[PDB]
Amino acid sequence: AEQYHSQVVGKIGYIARCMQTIDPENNLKKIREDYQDVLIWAEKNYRFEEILEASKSGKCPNDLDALSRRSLILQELLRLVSSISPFKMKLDLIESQYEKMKQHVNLWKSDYHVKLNQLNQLTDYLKNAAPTPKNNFLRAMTSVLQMQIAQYGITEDNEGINQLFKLGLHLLAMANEKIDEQYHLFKGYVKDQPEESPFEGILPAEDQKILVKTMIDYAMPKLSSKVLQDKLSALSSSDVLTKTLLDSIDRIVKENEKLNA
């Protein structure tokens, strides 16, 4: 009996704490407007017994099932903001993304939810992943994924975002011994995406250098002359992995075929 209204007070506070975690500076006026009937009981110095009585007498929203459904929506919005960190979504997009989540007929079978699930699976795997070429490839693309979700959201049709999910999950499914398949996937991604330097501002400068060295060290054993070896080493001066760099390596690899039958 009194346990139920204690749950109502708890759920009211949980929603407010979720809102405070998302928006501590009170910038999301539209989302807070949707929850003002709940938030008001936590931003005034009501004591527990007062909110408990407010639930017993109906002065606050006291349908526990309805409060939980509203809470899960806000929890999914917080997960979106948390899952893209260290990248940040602008205020108006946070609120428009919330509106899409709120208005969905079944949010928990939507691709918004499934995309968040699979994004978290990538970041979870990367937590304790050894710095192999495969995982460095995956970390680079997962970071681009987070940045594109922060810019475009998680609800609209985006072939770039789906391709990053696809290629990222494929790297995770690849065996550590399928080296040529890992590089073919990664090189293929950089060539097929539209940005000339798709990792600048997204990866740390040292991570970009490691990617450059990974491409050089992969192609170097194939070369059959010092002249072509020197041309490839001349490319290792680049601190950024660009589409141009990859094409310049492929031209050297192509020239090497003239020295082989």
Residue numbers in the entry: 0, 16 to 275
Can I see the authors' text?
The protein SidK, secreted by Legionella pneumophila, interacts with the V-ATPase to inhibit acidification of the phagolysosome in the early stages of infection. V-ATPases pump protons across a phospholipid membrane using energy from the hydrolysis of adenosine triphosphate (ATP) to adenosine diphosphate (ADP) and inorganic phosphate. Successful pathogens can subvert host defenses by secreting effectors that target V-ATPases to inhibit lysosomal acidification or lysosomal fusion with other cell compartments. This study reveals the structure of the V-ATPase:SidK complex, an assembly formed from the interaction of host and pathogen proteins involved in the infection of phagocytic white blood cells by Legionella pneumophila. Removal of the C-terminal residues 415–573 of SidK did not significantly affect V-ATPase inhibition by the SidK mutants, but truncations of the N-terminal region of the protein has been demonstrated to prevent V-ATPase inhibition. These data show that binding of the N-terminal domain of SidK to the V-ATPase is responsible for its partial yet specific inhibition of V-ATPase activity.
One SidK construct, consisting of residues 16–278 (SidK-N), yielded two crystal forms that diffracted X-rays to 2.3 to 2.4 Å resolution and the structure of SidK-N was determined from these crystals. The first crystal form contained one molecule of SidK(16–278) in the asymmetric unit and the final model included amino acids 16–274. The protein has an elongated and slightly bent α-helical structure consisting of three α-helical bundles. The three α-helical bundles contain four, four, and three α-helices, respectively, and are connected by loops in the bundles. The first α-helical bundle (α1–2, α5–6) also has an extension nearly perpendicular to the bundle axis that consists of two additional short α-helices (α3-α4) (green arrowheads). However, the N-terminal bundle with its extensions, which from previous analysis was proposed to be the region that interacts with the V-ATPase, does not resemble any other known protein structures. The monomeric SidK predominates in solution, even at high concentrations, and therefore the elongated monomer structure is expected to be the functional state of the protein. Only the N-terminal region of SidK interacts with the V-ATPase and consequently a highly-elongated SidK structure was unexpected. Mapping the contact surfaces in all three SidK:A-subunit pairs in the cryo-EM map to the SidK crystal structure, the main contact surface appears to involve residues Gly24, Tyr28, Phe62, Ser85, and Trp122 from the first α-helical bundle of SidK.
